Amino acid sequence: KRLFLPEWAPQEAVQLTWPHDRTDWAYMLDEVETCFVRIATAILRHERLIVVCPDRKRVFGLLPPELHHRLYCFELPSNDTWARDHGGISLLADGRPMIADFAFNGWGMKFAAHHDNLITRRLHALGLFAEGVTLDNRLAFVLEGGALETDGEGTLLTTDSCLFEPNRNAGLSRTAIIDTLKESLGVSRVLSLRHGALAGDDTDGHIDTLARFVDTRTIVYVRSEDPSDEHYSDLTAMEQELKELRRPDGQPYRLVPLPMAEALYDGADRLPATYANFLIINGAVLVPTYDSHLDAVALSVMQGLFPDREVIGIDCRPLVKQHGSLHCVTMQYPQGFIR
């Protein structure tokens, strides 16, 4: 008996894997590290914060003073900052908090991850989770958070392009892969979209960057507008696929369109900027900004969907230059999961 908690559920804290590169002394901070400080400072202001870094001294030294009591630093090696794809999945088993430690292999083996796929285990053995919280070893099944999206009702939303990656769980059949999700996460239905990809995306179309649940019966998604753009043809196909989706009660979902981020990139490589990659936390919502007249729209639409929490836009261009955004560098844990 399992239940996959939704993001908006009351949180205990948010985990962040600080960039490993940073270790040298300097007068200022790079565009990317100031970004993590911004995120870490947004979270630390509403709830506790967990940090996997190369040395506590830098972190505590960068984040606001005497706000440190909400800061938990763990010195452990890492290969990247995508806590969302390698972090532990929080869920309830027979009413008790449990952590599913799925396997992360660099998004289909695209990048070394010998350190990231160890982070969750070290953190558990190190006593990071609440006393009693079990660690359900699922290292035999590759799966990343970004590809996971639920409503807390046993409904899972993902993408086939990801769930059926040749370097993920190709050794299992389609059904075996879906059943594992239903048994690991206790989900009753898996709604996997076959359309939807973002240029610059090395994750293989994570539902994490296209469509998301804001409540038990609402889904926000990136709707393209320019039919001459390279995304329009598939994004439109996706939107038509969501219209099909029925809510648990049998009724159609309330779909809220999100503006397509403007073509922003560095070099002949277009970046996957997306407003869908927002972080929901206690009393607030962190929404990526890319310095365009569009992110002001994404803030209004998100603010209306969350009149309860405060929408806080964080510039995530230094992150999109790394083919990823805000939500990709975070992993939340609900109340009673952390010590």
Added chain:
Amino acid sequence: KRLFLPEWAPQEAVQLTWPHDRTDWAYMLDEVETCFVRIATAILRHERLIVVCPDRKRVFGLLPPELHHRLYCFELPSNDTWARDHGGISLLADGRPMIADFAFNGWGMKFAAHHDNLITRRLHALGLFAEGVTLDNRLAFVLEGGALETDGEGTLLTTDSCLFEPNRNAGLSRTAIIDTLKESLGVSRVLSLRHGALAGDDTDGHIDTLARFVDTRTIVYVRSEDPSDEHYSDLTAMEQELKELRRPDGQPYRLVPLPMAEALYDGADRLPATYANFLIINGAVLVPTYDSHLDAVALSVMQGLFPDREVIGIDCRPLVKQHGSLHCVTMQYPQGFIR
């Protein structure tokens, strides 16, 4: 009811994944490529050769035209050049020839492998294997031929340091992993050493670089005779483990020592040079050379064990620069498995 075929068994050809500019060899392609051409040539002289490369044209150009009729070329994407660890494992399933595709993830996700872990499937699709050759999908189990060693008598020799690596099959239990080998390879017994390893080694102690089966009743192994070295302690202990081993018929194995490769390394990082890393092919034994007065003693002992094959020595210093020798870039296929 399976059988894992030994290395000395008659072969149809050998596979090689040719290096390129899109690989780590980039800053020394000409140094390592002159090695491959040396190994390719030797193999193309006793049997056929399969090479996965970026463009057929270039490979044929470097190899002698007198041997183009045995040279096969498949243009497929690759990340590295270790056909030994990502290549397909040959075995007979009830007399019928079969190929097992085991997952390879960069030796524990230490390096990107999204391309290499696809060479086998891509090849089986391009019809590289003769009709009738089943392609057993074992992608659910991480395993590289470099950690495997058999006698063809149902015995397998490996190493705990590799078999129980945290990024290999941690999703499975110690006993579980061993039962997969017994099933996947049909081996009755799996003898795993808990001692032995090379300094600059990155494969986590592949048996491929320590003990080796030369015949159903003999084992060549790396011998350490200098207690002042950092390898003495570990190697001497391993020596005992091998001494404890016994053939399936009770009798103890014949243990012929091999000289610890002379200390050879570039910069400050010591290189994992090994004479145990040879390759047995129809009528010949390819052994690595490190321009040392020992690569003369090792060739001799090897010529003795195989008084029925030509003993060729290829300088594998460059190969070793990237931590790896001759045997690690090759993969033999029994006669009747290739078209």
